[PDB]
Scaffold this active site. Structure first.
Site, PDB file in Angstrom:
ATOM      1  N   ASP A 102     -92.811   2.932 -41.316  1.00  0.00           N
ATOM      2  CA  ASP A 102     -94.220   2.844 -40.923  1.00  0.00           C
ATOM      3  C   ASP A 102     -94.366   3.417 -39.494  1.00  0.00           C
ATOM      4  O   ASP A 102     -95.413   3.945 -39.116  1.00  0.00           O
ATOM      5  CB  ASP A 102     -94.692   1.379 -40.895  1.00  0.00           C
ATOM      6  CG  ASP A 102     -94.299   0.588 -42.129  1.00  0.00           C
ATOM      7  OD1 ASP A 102     -94.975   0.676 -43.167  1.00  0.00           O
ATOM      8  OD2 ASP A 102     -93.332  -0.182 -42.039  1.00  0.00           O
TER       9      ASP A 102
ATOM     10  N   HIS B 277     -94.049  -5.098 -43.407  1.00  0.00           N
ATOM     11  CA  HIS B 277     -93.889  -3.760 -43.912  1.00  0.00           C
ATOM     12  C   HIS B 277     -94.741  -3.804 -45.181  1.00  0.00           C
ATOM     13  O   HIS B 277     -94.269  -4.143 -46.277  1.00  0.00           O
ATOM     14  CB  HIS B 277     -92.420  -3.453 -44.238  1.00  0.00           C
ATOM     15  CG  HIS B 277     -92.245  -2.210 -45.045  1.00  0.00           C
ATOM     16  ND1 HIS B 277     -92.075  -2.236 -46.414  1.00  0.00           N
ATOM     17  CD2 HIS B 277     -92.330  -0.905 -44.702  1.00  0.00           C
ATOM     18  CE1 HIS B 277     -92.072  -1.000 -46.879  1.00  0.00           C
ATOM     19  NE2 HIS B 277     -92.229  -0.174 -45.860  1.00  0.00           N
TER      20      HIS B 277
END
Ligand SMILES: NC(=O)c1ccc[n+]([C@@H]2O[C@H](COP(=O)([O-])OP(=O)(O)OC[C@H]3O[C@@H](n4cnc5c(N)ncnc54)[C@H](O)[C@@H]3O)[C@@H](O)[C@H]2O)c1
Ligand SMILES: NC(=O)c1ccc[n+]([C@@H]2O[C@H](COP(=O)([O-])OP(=O)(O)OC[C@H]3O[C@@H](n4cnc5c(N)ncnc54)[C@H](O)[C@@H]3O)[C@@H](O)[C@H]2O)c1
Ligand SMILES: O=C([O-])CC(=O)C(=O)O
Ligand SMILES: O=C([O-])CC(=O)C(=O)O
Lengths: 327, 327
Positions: free
Chosen positions: B160, B188
């Site tokens: 990410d 996440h």
């Protein structure tokens, strides 16, 4: 420094999925060398879409060496000012495809791609053909590019080399990193001839350690020769990752040099070892200054010229069948 | 030097196919550091067979750093004397699998794997959980390993981070290599919160260059947040290669250090930023001497604590559902 422009074919495929991220990471031309990737896939929407996703992924890695990256559908644009070209894309031998249907299909991919490199690529571009049949495809492309020097058209025999390199370390229990002078002659096929007669580990003769020629003829050669298919037996899919490493090794060594070590390259014959000229052939070579050099004087015994015979013949067969596309 | 023993889970899967060859190549712990890979897959014949083929391929690359490589079916043996553990394998949320069926399935993978690491791995092994749900899986494993220090149990938020890193360079037209101080908070998941308020390019404020908060809330955040799914839109398959790079980056940075730069790590909370303790959470951290350190004093505005709120809640939700497996 001045980033090189690396054009890579079949970018949306398996080999490339392993190949592209290591090129961007700097594995192929050094860590201080930025790269501009110019990717080529067939013009179909599903291919290009996939090629879009792969590019999204390459960006998602934040590679500091990647100075640029574009997707193409035309070889004419994908080859523009290319310093290096990895021709990984090739037509797979589908259902009903006789050996002749394969050569005819792939011939038509490589004359076209060969004329485009000839036209827009760098005047001394390094080409390397991974897509099978590698050797015959590199020849087609080479013949289709009369403005470029033939020697720049190579074919990957480095997977068979690294596999022979793997088998020997396994047998000798020696680190694969220490195996010197191993090589492979001929076609990238099971017909290839891994020659361990000159290899050495710590100066010691590998051939003499094994001290068993039945292992050579019956185990080493057939295993290496059919390793690809064994990968498909286990994995269910081809050998993408290792082939992609081989190409990294091929270009890396060709460009950065082997510093004396011998390696294998499918190169256009200059008539060495009695191999007909212009025939892309596995030869033991040493690299330096951006160019290769065939290892000479190697003794070719009865067993060897015989194996060298079967592999050259297969190549001569393939050349014969693609001649009609080279009008 | 002394080779480290790297145990990697789900070795026969996609992430690993991209991950394993770069670990062996030395991308994760340095080029002067040999590695012993200890691979783990489910005990099924088709999995292990595939795991056999992948090992055949890794050898076929002749990696000089690979001092060893073994395949396992038992975490108890695959974790033996492991210095680092990449837990990539996890149970996919199949057809009919409610969020609860996922957490329950994966909980039972991670308590077992967590007790085995606890038992046979190194007394200060670095664990990293890639398999989803990453954060909650790293927590389970952590809780299941009371002899090991909690801080050694991390979860990957680096994909990410590298994706937010990619979006910013794209927007700013600036090299992704020059983006300083970017990070990601929380889980996440798409619920993650990429925080660009502190990022800088050449000392300049990224936030002020874009000079557009609607881009932040409406474009940057949702794109990064749903990049994974976009990869599946294009590729037809998940983001194996980029996730595998993130894990390389995570371990590499954790071990070798960020030299002052800030990065993101899903780590067990120590109560910083009001995050409950023992909650694996995305935090901006700097690494050194083999350990991380949470960046403190960052101003958390209304918009931020709100986003930090949604991501912590989701995590607290997941923790609640896996508690019953942590008896
Ligand atoms: N050289 C070796 O040692 C070695 C090793 C293993 C496999 N191979 C060969 O590598 C080649 C690629 O295999 P893969 O597994 O990566 O295949 P793949 O099917 O996953 O990828 C091939 C890609 O090339 C693309 N392509 C087809 N025609 C093209 C063209 N005209 N121009 C540009 N792109 C084109 C396809 O759309 C496809 O995505 C094959 O010919 C394969 O048999 C070679
Ligand atoms: N962390 C991230 O940022 C991120 C990014 C993308 C995907 N993912 C996740 O990564 C994980 C792996 O995805 P993939 O695409 O590589 O999957 P894959 O299906 O290709 O591989 C998963 C592998 O783990 C194995 N496995 C299952 N249970 C195991 C166990 N009990 N012990 C050991 N091995 C086990 C499976 O047999 C399988 O081969 C998934 O949970 C996926 O959703 C995470
Ligand atoms: O390399 C491959 O995948 C196939 C090949 O040439 C072999 O086994 O001869
Ligand atoms: O990283 C992935 O593939 C999926 C993911 O977390 C996303 O888009 O949130």
């Amino acid at each position: 420094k001045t980033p090189m422009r690396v054009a890579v074919t079949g970018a949306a495929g398996q080999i490339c999925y392993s190949l592209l991220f290591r090129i961007a990471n700097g594995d192929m031309l050094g860590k201080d060398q930025p790269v501009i990737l110019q990717l080529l896939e067939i013009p179909n929407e599903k291919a290009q879409k996939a090629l879009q996703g792969v590019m999204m992924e390459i960006d998602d890695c934040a590679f500091p060496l990647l100075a640029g990256m574009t997707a193409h559908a035309d070889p004419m644009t994908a080859f523009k000012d290319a310093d290096v070209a990895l021709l990984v894309g090739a037509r797979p031998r589908g259902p009903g495809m006789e050996r002749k249907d394969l050569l005819e299909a792939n011939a038509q991919i490589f004359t076209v791609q060969g004329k485009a490199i000839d036209a827009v690529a760098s005047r001394n571009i390094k080409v390397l053909v991974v897509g099978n049949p590698a050797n015959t495809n590199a020849y087609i492309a080479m013949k289709s590019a009369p403005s470029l020097p033939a020697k720049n058209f190579t074919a990957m025999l480095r997977l068979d080399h690294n596999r022979a390199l793997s088998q020997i370390a396994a047998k000798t229990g020696k680190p694969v990193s220490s195996i010197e002078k191993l090589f492979v002659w001929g076609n990238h096929s099971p017909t290839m001839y891994a020659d361990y007669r000159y290899a050495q580990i710590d100066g010691a003769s590998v051939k003499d350690m094994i001290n068993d020629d039945a292992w050579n003829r019956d185990t080493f050669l057939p295993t290496v020769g059919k390793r690809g298919a064994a990968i498909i037996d286990a994995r269910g899919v081809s050998s993408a990752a290792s082939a992609a490493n081989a190409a990294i090794d091929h270009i890396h060594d060709w460009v950065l040099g082997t510093a004396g070590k011998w390696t294998t390259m499918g190169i256009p014959s200059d008539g060495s070892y009695g191999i007909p000229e212009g025939v892309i052939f596995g030869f033991p070579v040493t690299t330096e200054n951006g160019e290769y050099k065939i290892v000479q004087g190697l003794s070719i015994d009865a067993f060897s010229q015989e194996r060298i015979n079967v592999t050259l013949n297969e190549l001569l067969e393939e050349q014969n069948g693609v001649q009609h596309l080279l009008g």
